[PDB]
PDB file of C-alpha atoms and ligand atoms in Angstrom:
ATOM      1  CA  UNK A   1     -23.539  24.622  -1.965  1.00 56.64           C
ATOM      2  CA  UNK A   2     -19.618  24.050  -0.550  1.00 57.19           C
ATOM      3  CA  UNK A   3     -19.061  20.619   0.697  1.00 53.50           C
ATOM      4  CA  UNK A   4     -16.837  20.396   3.701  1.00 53.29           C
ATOM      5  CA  UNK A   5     -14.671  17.631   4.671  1.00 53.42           C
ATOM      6  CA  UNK A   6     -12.805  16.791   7.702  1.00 57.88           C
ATOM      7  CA  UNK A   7      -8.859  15.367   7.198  1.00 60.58           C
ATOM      8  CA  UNK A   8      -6.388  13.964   9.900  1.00 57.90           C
ATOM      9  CA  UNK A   9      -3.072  14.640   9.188  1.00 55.54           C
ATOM     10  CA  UNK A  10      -0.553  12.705  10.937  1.00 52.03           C
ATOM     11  CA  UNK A  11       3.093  12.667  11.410  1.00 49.99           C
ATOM     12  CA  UNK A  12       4.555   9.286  10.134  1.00 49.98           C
ATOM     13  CA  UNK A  13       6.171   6.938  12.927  1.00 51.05           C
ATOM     14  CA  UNK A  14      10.422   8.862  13.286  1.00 48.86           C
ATOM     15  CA  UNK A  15      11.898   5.887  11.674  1.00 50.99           C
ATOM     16  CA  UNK A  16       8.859   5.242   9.272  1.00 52.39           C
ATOM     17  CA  UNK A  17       9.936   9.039   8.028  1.00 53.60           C
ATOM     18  CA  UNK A  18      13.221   8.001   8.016  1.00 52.56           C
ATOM     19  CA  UNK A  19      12.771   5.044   5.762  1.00 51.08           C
ATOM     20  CA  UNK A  20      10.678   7.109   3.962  1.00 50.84           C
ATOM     21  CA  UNK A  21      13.440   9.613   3.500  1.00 50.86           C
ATOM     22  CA  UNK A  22      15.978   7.083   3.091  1.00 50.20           C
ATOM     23  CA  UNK A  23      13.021   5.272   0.041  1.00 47.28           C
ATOM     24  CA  UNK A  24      13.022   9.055  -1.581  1.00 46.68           C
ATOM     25  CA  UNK A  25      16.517  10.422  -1.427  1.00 45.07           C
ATOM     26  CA  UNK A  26      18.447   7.332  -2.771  1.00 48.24           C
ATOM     27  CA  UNK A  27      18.921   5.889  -6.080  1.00 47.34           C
ATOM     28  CA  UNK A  28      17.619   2.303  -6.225  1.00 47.99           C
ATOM     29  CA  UNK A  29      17.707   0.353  -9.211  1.00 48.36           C
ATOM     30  CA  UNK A  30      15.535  -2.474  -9.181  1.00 45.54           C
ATOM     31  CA  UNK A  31      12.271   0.025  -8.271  1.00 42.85           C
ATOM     32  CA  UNK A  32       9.704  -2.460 -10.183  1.00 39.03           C
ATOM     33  CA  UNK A  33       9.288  -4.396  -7.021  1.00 41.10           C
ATOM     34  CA  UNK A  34       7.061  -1.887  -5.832  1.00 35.87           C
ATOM     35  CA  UNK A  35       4.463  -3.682  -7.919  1.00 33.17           C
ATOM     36  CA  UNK A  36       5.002  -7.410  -6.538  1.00 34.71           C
ATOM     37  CA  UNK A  37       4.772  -5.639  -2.749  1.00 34.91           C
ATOM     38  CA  UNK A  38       1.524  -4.487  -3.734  1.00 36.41           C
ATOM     39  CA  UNK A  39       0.036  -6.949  -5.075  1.00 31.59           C
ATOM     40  CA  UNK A  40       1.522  -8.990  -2.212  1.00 36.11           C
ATOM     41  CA  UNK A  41      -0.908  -7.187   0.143  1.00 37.09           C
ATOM     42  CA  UNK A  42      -3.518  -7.183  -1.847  1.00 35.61           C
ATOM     43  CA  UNK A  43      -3.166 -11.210  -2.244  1.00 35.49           C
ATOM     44  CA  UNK A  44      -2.710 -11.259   1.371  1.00 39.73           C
ATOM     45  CA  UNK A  45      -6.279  -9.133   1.875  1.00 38.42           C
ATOM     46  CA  UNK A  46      -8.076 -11.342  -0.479  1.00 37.86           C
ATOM     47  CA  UNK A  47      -7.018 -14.032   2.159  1.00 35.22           C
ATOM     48  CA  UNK A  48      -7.745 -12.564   4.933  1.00 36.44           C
ATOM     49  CA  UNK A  49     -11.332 -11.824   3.369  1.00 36.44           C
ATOM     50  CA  UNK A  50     -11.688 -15.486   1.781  1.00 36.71           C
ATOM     51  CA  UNK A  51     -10.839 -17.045   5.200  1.00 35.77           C
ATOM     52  CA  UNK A  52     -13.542 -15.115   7.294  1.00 33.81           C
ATOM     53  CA  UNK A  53     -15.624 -15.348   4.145  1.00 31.58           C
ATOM     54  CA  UNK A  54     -16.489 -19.425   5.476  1.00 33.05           C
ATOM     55  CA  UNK A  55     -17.445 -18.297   8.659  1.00 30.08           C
ATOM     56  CA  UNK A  56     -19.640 -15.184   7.610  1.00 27.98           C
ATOM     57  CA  UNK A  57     -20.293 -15.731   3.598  1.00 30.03           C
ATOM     58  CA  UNK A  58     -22.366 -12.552   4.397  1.00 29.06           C
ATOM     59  CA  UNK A  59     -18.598 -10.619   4.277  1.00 26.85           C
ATOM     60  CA  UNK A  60     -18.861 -11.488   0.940  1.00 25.75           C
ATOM     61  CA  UNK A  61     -22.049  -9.080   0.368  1.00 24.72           C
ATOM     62  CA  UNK A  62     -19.930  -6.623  -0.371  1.00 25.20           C
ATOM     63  CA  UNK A  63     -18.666  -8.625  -3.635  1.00 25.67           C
ATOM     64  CA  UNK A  64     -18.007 -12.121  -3.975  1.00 26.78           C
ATOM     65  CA  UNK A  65     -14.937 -12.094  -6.873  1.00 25.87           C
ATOM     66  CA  UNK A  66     -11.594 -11.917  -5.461  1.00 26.48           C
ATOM     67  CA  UNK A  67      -9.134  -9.824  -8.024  1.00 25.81           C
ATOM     68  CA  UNK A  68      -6.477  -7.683  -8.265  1.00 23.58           C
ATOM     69  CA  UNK A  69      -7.018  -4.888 -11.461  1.00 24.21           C
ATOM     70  CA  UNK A  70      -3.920  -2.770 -12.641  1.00 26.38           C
ATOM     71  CA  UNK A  71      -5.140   0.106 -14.003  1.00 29.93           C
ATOM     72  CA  UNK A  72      -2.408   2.478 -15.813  1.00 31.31           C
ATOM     73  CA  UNK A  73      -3.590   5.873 -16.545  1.00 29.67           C
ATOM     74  CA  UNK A  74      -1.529   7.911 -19.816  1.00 33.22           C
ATOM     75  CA  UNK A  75      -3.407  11.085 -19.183  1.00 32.07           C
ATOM     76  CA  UNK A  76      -3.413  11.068 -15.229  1.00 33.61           C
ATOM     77  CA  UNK A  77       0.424   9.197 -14.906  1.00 33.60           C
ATOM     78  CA  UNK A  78      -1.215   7.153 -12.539  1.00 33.08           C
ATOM     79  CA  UNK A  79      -0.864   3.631 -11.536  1.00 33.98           C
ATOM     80  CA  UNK A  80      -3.959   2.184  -9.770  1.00 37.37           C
ATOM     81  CA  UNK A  81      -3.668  -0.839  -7.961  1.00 39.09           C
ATOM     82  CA  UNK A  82      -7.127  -2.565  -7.326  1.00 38.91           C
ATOM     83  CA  UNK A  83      -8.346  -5.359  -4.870  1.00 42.33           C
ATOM     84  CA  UNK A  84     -11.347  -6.570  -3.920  1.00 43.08           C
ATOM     85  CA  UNK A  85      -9.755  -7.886  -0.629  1.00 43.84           C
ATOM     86  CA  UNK A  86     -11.051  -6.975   2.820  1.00 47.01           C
ATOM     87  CA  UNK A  87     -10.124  -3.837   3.148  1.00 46.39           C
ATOM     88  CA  UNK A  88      -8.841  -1.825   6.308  1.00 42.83           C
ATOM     89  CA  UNK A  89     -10.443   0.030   9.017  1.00 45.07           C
ATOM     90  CA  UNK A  90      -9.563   2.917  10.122  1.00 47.36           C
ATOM     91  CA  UNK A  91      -6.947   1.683  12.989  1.00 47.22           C
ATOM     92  CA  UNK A  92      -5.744  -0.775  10.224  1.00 49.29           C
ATOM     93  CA  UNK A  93      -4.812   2.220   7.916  1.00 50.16           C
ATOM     94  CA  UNK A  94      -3.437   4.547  10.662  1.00 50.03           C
ATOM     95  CA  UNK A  95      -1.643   1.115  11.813  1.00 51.26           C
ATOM     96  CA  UNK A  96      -1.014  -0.413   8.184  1.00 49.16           C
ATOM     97  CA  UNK A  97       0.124   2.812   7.040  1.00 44.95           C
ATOM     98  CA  UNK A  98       2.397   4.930   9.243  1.00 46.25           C
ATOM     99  CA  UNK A  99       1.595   5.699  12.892  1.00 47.84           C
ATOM    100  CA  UNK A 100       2.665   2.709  14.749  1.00 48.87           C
ATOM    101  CA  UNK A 101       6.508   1.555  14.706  1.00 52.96           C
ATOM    102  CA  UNK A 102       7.638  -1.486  12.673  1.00 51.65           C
ATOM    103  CA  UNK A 103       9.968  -4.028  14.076  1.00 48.15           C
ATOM    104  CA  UNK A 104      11.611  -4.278  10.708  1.00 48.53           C
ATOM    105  CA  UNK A 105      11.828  -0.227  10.097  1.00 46.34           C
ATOM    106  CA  UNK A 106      15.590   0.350  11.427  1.00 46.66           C
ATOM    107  CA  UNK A 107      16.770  -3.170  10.687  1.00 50.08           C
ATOM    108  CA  UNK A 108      15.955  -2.452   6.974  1.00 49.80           C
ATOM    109  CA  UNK A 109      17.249   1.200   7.068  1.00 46.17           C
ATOM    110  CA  UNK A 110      20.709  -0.327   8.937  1.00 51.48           C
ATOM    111  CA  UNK A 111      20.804  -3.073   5.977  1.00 49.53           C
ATOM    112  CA  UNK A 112      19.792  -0.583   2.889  1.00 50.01           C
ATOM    113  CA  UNK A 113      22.704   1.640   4.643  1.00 49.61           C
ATOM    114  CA  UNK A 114      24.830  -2.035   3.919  1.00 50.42           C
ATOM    115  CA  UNK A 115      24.169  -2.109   0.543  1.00 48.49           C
ATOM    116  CA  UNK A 116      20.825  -4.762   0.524  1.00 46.00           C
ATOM    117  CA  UNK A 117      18.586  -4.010  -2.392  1.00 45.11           C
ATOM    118  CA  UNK A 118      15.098  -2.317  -1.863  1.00 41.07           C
ATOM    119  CA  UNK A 119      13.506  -5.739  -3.163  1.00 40.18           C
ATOM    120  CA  UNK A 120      14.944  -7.395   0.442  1.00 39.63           C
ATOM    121  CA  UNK A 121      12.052  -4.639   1.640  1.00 42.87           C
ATOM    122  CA  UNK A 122       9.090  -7.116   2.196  1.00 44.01           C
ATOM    123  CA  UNK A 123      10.947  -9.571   4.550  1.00 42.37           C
ATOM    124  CA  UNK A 124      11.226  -6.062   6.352  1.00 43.59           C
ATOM    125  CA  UNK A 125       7.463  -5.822   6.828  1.00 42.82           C
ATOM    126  CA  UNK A 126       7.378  -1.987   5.227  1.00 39.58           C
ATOM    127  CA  UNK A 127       7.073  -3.321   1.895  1.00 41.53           C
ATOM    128  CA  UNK A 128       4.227  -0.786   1.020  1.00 44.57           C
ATOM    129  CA  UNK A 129       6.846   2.263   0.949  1.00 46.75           C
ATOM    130  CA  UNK A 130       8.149   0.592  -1.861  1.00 46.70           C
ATOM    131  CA  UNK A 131       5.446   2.791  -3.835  1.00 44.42           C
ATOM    132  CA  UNK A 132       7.225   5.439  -3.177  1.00 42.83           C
ATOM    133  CA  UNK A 133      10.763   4.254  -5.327  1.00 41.24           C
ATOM    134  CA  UNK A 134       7.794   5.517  -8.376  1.00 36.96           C
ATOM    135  CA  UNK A 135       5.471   7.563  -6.902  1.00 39.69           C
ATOM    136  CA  UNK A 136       5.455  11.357  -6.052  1.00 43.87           C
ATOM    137  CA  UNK A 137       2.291  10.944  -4.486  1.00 44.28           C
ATOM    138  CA  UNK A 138       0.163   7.842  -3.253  1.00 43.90           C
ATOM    139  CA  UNK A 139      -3.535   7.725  -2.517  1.00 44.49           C
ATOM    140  CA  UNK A 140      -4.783   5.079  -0.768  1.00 44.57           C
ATOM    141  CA  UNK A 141      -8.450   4.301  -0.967  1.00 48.31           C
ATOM    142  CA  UNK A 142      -9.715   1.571   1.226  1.00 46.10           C
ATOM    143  CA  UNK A 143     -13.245  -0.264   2.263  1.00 47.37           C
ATOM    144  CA  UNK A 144     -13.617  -2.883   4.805  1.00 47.33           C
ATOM    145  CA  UNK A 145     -16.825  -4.425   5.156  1.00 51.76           C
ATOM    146  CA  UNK A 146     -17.148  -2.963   8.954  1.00 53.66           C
ATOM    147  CA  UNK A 147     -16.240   0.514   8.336  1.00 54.49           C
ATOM    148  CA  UNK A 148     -15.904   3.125   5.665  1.00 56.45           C
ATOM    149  CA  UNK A 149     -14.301   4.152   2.528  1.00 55.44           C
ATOM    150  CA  UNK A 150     -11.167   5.758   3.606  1.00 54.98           C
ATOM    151  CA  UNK A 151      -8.558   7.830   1.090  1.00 53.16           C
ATOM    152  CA  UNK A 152      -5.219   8.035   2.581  1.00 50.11           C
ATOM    153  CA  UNK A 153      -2.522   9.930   1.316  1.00 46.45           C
ATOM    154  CA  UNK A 154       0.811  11.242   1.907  1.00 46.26           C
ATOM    155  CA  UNK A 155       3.504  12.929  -0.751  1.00 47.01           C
ATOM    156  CA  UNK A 156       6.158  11.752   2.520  1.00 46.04           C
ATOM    157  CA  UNK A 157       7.531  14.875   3.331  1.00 46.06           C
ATOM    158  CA  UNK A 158       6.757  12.747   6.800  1.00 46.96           C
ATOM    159  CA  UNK A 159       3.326  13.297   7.003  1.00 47.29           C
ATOM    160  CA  UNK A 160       0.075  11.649   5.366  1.00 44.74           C
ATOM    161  CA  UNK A 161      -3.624  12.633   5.224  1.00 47.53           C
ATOM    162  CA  UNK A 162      -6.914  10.345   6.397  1.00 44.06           C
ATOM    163  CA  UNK A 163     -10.191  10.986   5.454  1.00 40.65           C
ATOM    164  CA  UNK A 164     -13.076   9.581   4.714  1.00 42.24           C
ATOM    165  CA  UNK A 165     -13.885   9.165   1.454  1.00 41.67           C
ATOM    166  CA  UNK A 166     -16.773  11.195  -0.367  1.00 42.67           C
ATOM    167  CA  UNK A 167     -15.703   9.640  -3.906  1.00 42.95           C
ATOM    168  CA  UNK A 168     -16.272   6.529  -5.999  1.00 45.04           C
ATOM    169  CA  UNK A 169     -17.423   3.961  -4.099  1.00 42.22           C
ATOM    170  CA  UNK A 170     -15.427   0.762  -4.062  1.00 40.38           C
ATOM    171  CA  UNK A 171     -17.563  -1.726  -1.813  1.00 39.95           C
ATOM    172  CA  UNK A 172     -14.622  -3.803  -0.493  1.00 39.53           C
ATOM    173  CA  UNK A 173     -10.760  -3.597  -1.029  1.00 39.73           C
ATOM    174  CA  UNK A 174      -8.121  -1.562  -0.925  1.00 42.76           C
ATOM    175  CA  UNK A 175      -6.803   0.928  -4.143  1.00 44.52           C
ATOM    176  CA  UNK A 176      -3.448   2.117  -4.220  1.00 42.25           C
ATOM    177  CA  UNK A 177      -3.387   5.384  -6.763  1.00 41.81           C
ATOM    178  CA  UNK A 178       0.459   5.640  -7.241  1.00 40.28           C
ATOM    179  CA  UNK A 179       1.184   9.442  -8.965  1.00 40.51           C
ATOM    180  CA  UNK A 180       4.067   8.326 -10.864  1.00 37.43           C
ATOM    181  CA  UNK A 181       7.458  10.708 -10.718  1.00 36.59           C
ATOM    182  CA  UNK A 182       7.915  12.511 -14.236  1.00 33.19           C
ATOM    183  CA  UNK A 183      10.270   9.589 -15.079  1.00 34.73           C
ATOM    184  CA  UNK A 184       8.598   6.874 -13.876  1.00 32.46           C
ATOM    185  CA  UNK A 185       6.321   6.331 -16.379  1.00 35.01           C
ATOM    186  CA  UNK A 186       7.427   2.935 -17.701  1.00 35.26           C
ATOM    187  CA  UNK A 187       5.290   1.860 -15.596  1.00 34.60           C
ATOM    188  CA  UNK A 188       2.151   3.084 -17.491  1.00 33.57           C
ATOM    189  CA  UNK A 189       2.832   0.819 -20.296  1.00 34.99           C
ATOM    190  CA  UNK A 190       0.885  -2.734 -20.634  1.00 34.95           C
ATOM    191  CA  UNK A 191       4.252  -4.509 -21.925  1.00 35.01           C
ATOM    192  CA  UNK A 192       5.973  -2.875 -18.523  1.00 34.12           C
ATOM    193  CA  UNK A 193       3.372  -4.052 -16.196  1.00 37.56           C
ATOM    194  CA  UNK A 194       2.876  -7.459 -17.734  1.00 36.80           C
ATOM    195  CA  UNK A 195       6.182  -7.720 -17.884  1.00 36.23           C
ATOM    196  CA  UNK A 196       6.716  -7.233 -13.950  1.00 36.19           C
ATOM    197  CA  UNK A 197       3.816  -9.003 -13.031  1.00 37.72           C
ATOM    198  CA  UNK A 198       5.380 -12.184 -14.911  1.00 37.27           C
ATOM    199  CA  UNK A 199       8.333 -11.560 -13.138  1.00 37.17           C
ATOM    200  CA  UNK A 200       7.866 -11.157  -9.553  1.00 34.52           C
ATOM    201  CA  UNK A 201       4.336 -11.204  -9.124  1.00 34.98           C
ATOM    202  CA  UNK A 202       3.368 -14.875 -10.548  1.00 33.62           C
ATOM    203  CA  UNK A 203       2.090 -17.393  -7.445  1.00 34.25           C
ATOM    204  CA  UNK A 204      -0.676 -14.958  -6.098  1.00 34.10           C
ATOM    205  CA  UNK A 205      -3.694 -17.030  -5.747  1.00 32.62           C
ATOM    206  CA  UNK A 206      -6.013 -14.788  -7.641  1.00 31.18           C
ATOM    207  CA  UNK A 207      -6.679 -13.405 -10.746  1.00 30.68           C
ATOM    208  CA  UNK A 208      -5.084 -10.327 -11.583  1.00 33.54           C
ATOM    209  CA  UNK A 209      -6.523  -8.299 -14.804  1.00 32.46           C
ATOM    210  CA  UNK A 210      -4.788  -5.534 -16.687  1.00 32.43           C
ATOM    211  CA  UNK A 211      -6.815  -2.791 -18.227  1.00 29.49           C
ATOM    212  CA  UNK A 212      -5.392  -0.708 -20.946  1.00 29.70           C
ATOM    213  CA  UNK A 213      -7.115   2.130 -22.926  1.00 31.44           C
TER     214      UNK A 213
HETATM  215  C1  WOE B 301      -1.581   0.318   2.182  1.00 27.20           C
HETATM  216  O1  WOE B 301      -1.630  -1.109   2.108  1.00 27.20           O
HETATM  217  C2  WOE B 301      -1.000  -1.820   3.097  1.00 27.20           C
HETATM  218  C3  WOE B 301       0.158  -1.416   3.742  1.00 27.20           C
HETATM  219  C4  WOE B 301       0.714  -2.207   4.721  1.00 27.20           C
HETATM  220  C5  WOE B 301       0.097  -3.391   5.090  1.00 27.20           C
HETATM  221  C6  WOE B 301      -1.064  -3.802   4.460  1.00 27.20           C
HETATM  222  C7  WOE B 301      -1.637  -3.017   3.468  1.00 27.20           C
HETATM  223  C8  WOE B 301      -2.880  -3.484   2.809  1.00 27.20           C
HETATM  224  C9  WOE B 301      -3.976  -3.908   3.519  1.00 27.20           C
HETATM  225  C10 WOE B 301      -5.077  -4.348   2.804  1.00 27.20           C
HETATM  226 CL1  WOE B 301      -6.477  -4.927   3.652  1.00 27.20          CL
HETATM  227  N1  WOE B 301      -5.140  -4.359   1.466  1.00 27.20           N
HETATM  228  C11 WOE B 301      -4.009  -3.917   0.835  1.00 27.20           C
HETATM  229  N2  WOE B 301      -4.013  -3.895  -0.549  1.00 27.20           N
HETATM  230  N3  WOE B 301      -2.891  -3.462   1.465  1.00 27.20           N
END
């Protein structure tokens, strides 16, 4: 029996596209950062979570550890960044992640334009599109504890996909599935990702695990 399945697909905020554009169409050295923005996030969600977590410790039913997993996938050329943080709603993805204008978008496209390296992205707050200096594709999954599992998804092109997601469960966080350009796959290797991790990725207040096949 077919399953059917209902998507959303928006049209990404004009300068949003444009950075995206702008992300895609350049040559940035210095990509790796993509890593440290995402696990800046997810650091950032297991905070957010934590914090309401001593008001309602029943936010925590959903699971109790607070991590971060890097999963790096040979076979698949995926990078899968995993967090048990709290996750977004729908209207925090849709804002999070593309419909709604960012103060920093066109100040970070004028200073980019200058010259200022991609890793000045986060003080931009669009440090997310970083993911796509690597990726060809990202798939966002995400689960907040009032709402449900949504996958995300856009391949820019200035347009992403929501829908809800019929697919592993994940119980709380957010997963960010980065389909890695053909040469991008440095990032696949454990000695790469520690490596980065090390590097710009050090104070988060949570442990971070790296699983390797
Ligand atoms: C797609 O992830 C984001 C993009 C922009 C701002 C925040 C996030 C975010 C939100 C949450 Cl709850 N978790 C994570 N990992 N990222």
């Amino acid at each position: 029996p077919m399953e059917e399945e209902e998507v959303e697909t928006f049209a990404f905020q004009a300068e949003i596209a444009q950075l995206m554009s702008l992300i895609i169409n350049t040559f940035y050295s210095n990509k790796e950062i993509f890593l440290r923005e995402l696990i800046s996030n997810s650091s950032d969600a297991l905070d957010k979570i934590r914090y309401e977590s001593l008001t309602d410790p029943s936010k925590l039913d959903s699971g109790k550890e607070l991590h971060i997993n890097l999963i790096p996938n040979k076979q698949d050329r995926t990078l899968t960044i995993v967090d048990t943080g709290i996750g977004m709603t729908k209207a925090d993805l849709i804002n999070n992640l593309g419909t709604i204008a960012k103060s920093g978008t066109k100040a970070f496209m004028e200073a980019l334009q200058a010259g200022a390296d991609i890793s000045m992205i986060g003080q931009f707050g669009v440090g997310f599109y970083s993911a796509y200096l690597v990726a060809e594709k990202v798939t966002v999954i995400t689960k907040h504890n009032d709402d449900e599992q949504y996958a995300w998804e856009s391949s820019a092109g200035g347009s992403f996909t929501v829908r809800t997601d019929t697919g592993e469960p994940m119980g709380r966080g957010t997963k960010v599935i980065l389909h890695l350009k053909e040469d991008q796959t440095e990032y696949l290797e454990e000695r790469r990702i520690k490596e980065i991790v090390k590097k710009h990725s050090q104070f988060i207040g949570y442990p971070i695990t790296l699983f390797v096949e």
